[model samples]
Target: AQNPNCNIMIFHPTKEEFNDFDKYIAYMESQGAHRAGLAKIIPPKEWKARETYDNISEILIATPLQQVASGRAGVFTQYHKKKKAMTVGEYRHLANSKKYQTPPHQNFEDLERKYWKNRIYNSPIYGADISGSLFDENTKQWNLGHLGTIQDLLEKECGVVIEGVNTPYLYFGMWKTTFAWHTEDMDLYSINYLHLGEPKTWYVVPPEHGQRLERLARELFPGSSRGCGAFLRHKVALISPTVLKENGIPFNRITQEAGEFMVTFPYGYHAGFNHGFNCAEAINFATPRWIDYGKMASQCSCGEARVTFSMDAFVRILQPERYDLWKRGQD
Candidate 1:
């Protein structure tokens, strides 16, 4: 069973309203839509970005999905998962199932084995540092980095595009492909857009219960927790939502289809699976509201202890006066 309030609030907004970005986010928060940790917005028609996969040589990796339903198999280090490397055309052939002329992988028998069940197909298309990748600046317009209170403050101070933060990272997914539960890096806001293809389903937990979830994970994986406070950073443990809901944590679900956008709030824990073949891009952005949470993250405070970027650096670099934080008329 899911949370009593398991449903995600879907907003229908015109391009003008959605294009404003931050303002719409504030309004959504005011409506208590973020209580589920996430909300979906079906932007005005024609509000879409391109997810190119023409470069066939770009080697993509797919992960073997374990049966997490079993007590022990449910959670493990993400790095330990097996990787099946294949090209775009091969993946397309597998996904389309137009009819396999020969086996896709040599080590494995024909595609008949249940082995292909829960594999995570081509994700993270280009490595984080997208130098000469096909998905260059065209994605920047849609990237959440542009419309923000501070361009990282760090971005202006340090002349470098922080990958996955301001820089857009592309992903390709196939049936039952799952990304384990975790908060965004630095606990900042994340915005994902599905360029096209099948819908992607998501499960999110409200920030209010962030501590509770941590306690639960620590209890379930005592060995991992004892071994290292940074255990969560491994991106391995795929916690059962049934487990989270059984504990009465506020867990909810959403289906994000083509041309739609999903926004995950600060400290909001989210994870999801793809319905079928699809393409997506995600980037992290910050607002005044996220600073407190980002600043507060420390050793195992929120079930994770890896700091991909420094919040202190952001504050120190941009010396914006305090009163200006309240300078706006609404303030």
Candidate 2:
């Protein structure tokens, strides 16, 4: 396909590319940007090559096996050992634990329940890509199989041009802990359905002001460990419009069977806070394939020699399904 050279452009963005990241690092340092963790390294430079954990990212982020063997895991390893570094079997076990099914925090539940109930009725704060599902921590996976009827209705019978008809088998992690700055996948409409709690807030900005926003984030929140950059340059953006428990604007659309609205965001900056909850829901990331200098493009050929290494780390964090697609070239 003609979509073969996005990488050639990103990694070597220009003839004016910096030879060393130190100057940028120094600029960030002068701005008070602290080296928080490796995840912070993703946005600016696409994971380039396979390498150790010390760099921005690793090529093939090993499962916990890789972490422990390399002595890179923290002490929480023992308590979170089952959940921390795990592969398919191990990851499943951790995911399905009783701990996830049962919640100890009444506050968290109250908030999440309130949010869900409201969204069901109000549908305020317009956006696209609406979806809902329950995670059976007891099963350690989403019961996507339950959606067979949905698949039949949406595809086989209606001839709805079904894409992924089945309940969209999926996985999730401690979203409360998952911190990603603004960016969107151009391929399809997406929504990180919040099942448990609401973090900071969600905002959508105009495309024209994106770069200005990122520059502000970089300059002000230099220490912030999440993704940051110009908005237009990014595929997604956050909406000033937000869905909340009390104050969220009503969007006026609702459907449990399937969402009528599809949020195919072009350019915007969105953000969320990381919180811990025995939460469950699917982060409906939909898309077929589109080419742009967005994240997907970077997945293929962005970054320096070090990109592969960082990408590997990210791959380790991704669920098996995503890993397969990314491997197949949807990056």
Candidate 3:
């Protein structure tokens, strides 16, 4: 018998199936990212090096410093050019030191631009807005097959397209750059596809056990609630998978390689670090099943809610069209 709490699923799509978007979606919905905390998709066809990697490398090189955001150490604010630009050896020392203080920036904007080109690994450059179209000009088709239909129809009917927080967000990460542990907004789903470059390491906790992990965190860091808000405030403490497994908490780890897609389900707590320099795109979505959970997540006291749009607002727009499916408990 399979573990009821088994939380990671993997999918390999062949060339023929990859071309069929509805079929792909149906297959994924069938497996249920809800039950599995994460899903991975490895396409039959590999992405070309020249068209993607070479072109993006050129773009990043040409991109002005001001456009990039400093994402070092997983903390966006309080970025210091000198601190982030430190050598690996210097960083290790500084990272452990009790007296190390992040050099204050006199002018935030200037410091950002100054460090943008300096530490390419820790800086993320925003490339495209995936809310409108995922059409890859190089392939002359949608990047991830035809999954854009959801976004297209949602925008057409609701007159609202959730970009950035709600829609796909692009990122470029390098060695040691990290994203802190957190769940997708509104307890929704997220798909992160690496366009090119190095692999990323991911750590996940089953959604049902998220609270338990938080409680454990509170025990370690007294006075901290281990909520998303609290984690964001005190970004220094890192609780590894080893710690979780030792405590009998469920945990999962994945090494997402280039040209692969990783799906994070509703309420799945995940955090990761880039193995090296890498480029990736991430987007959030809501299915019919997510309606109730979305509402609850929006109302959650975590203080780091991922609800950009109200679940009721989405339901209002979708109920009429999906009444039959909704009644049937279909996603």
Candidate 4:
């Protein structure tokens, strides 16, 4: 039912490829992007692998609003001593301070990025990746290509606040830093762009097999769901690809590189680890088609109860209007 490289689709598409971007969006929706999982959009050399965290930090630290504050940004270690959370500012400081201490001493340029792969948990630079303005004063436009327009339309047209979804967080991961297997809230779509650094590998299980995989997880580690809890605060149980393969569960893998975008669809169970030091930005958004699943996701057992509009209110005020547009063949 699947190819050996069934998990991820990689393409170096041109602007003409998505003449009507919505068609591409629909293709993603219809094909069940979550199941197909991990579409890597390879940016051109000029647009790819352009910036580093140190370069980013210099810009951020200069801004008065980019003050360092303690936050819940940390890592889930593979074995003993899973580290705790720390502030973005402090994490960078420690990494920078201990720069010379690392072995195989070389020039600072060679190791500045390498320090990010250290055990210290670093937070993603949320909202910073929206455009080049954050790091470059002259560039007001975002380099995200189609993703930028999709986010803009979703926010400006639909009532979903892009802030709540798009670039809500920045991810700076090092070796062994893990984002456990889970889906975005309310089954919304998420896109991760690796600005620069070593490649990060992703394991994706399509939505069709999500239930079976969840069941297998429970049987293998009863009460493991409790570890992930409502907030998904714990390191999720690692589901082996071999186990999924033997059980006839189709899955995919993507080793995302610099200047590439990895799109994960609604309810796609995904987990991955950074190969080494890396910087990536991720955000979530919804299309009209996501309404049904978002409603269901809001009611799931693992749902996070927050102060937001109920499904009823969403349906009453927002759904009908979006549904009408959908009926009229609008995005």
Best-matching candidate per lDDT? 1
How do the predictions measure up, each by TM-score? 0.68, 0.30, 0.61, 0.60
Residue 14 in candidate 1, Cα distance off native in Å: 0.7
lDDT against the true structure, per candidate, is 0.57, 0.27, 0.52, 0.50
**lDDT per residue as tens, model 3, 1-331:** 2436665778887777767644565577576544557778886765331253433322322121112233332223222122223232333343334432222355433333333333333343222222332227455222643345344445654577743223455565554455556676446677788876656778788777877766776666554453433453223334555466778778887778887888787777787655445567777765555555654552333433223343434544444453343333312
- Which pairs in model 1 have colliding backbones? 78-236
* Model 2 worst lDDT run, 10 consecutive residues: 70-79
Order the candidates by lDDT, highest first. 1, 3, 4, 2
lDDT of 2 by residue, 11-105 (tens): 12221223333243234323322211000111224322122213211211132211111111110110111213333344334434553222344
Task: Rank the candidate models, highest TM-score first.
Answer: 1, 3, 4, 2
Stretches of model 1 off by over 4 angstroms after superposition: 1-7, 51-86, 96-165, 300-331
Which ten-residue region of model 4 has the weakest summed lDDT?
Answer: 62-71
lDDT of 1 at 21: 73
The residue pairs found clashing in candidate 3 are 185-306
Q: For model 4, how does the per-residue alpha-carbon lDDT over 211-324 read when each residue is reduced to its tens digit?
A: 766666655555545543333323334554555676776677767877677878777778765654556767665666665565555222232223232223343334554434
- Which residue ranges in model 4 land beyond 4 Å of their true spot? 1-6, 18-23, 27-34, 45-54, 58-166, 225-235, 298-331
Query: Candidate 1, residues 1-331: lDDT per residue as tens digits?
Result: 2333535678888766756676887787777766677888887765545455465434453442332322333343343333465654555455555331222434222221222232332222211112122333454444443445345443543564443234555565665455767887657788887765666778787887777777878887788788766456545566655567677766776678877889898888887666556667677777667767655543333324433344334433332342233123112
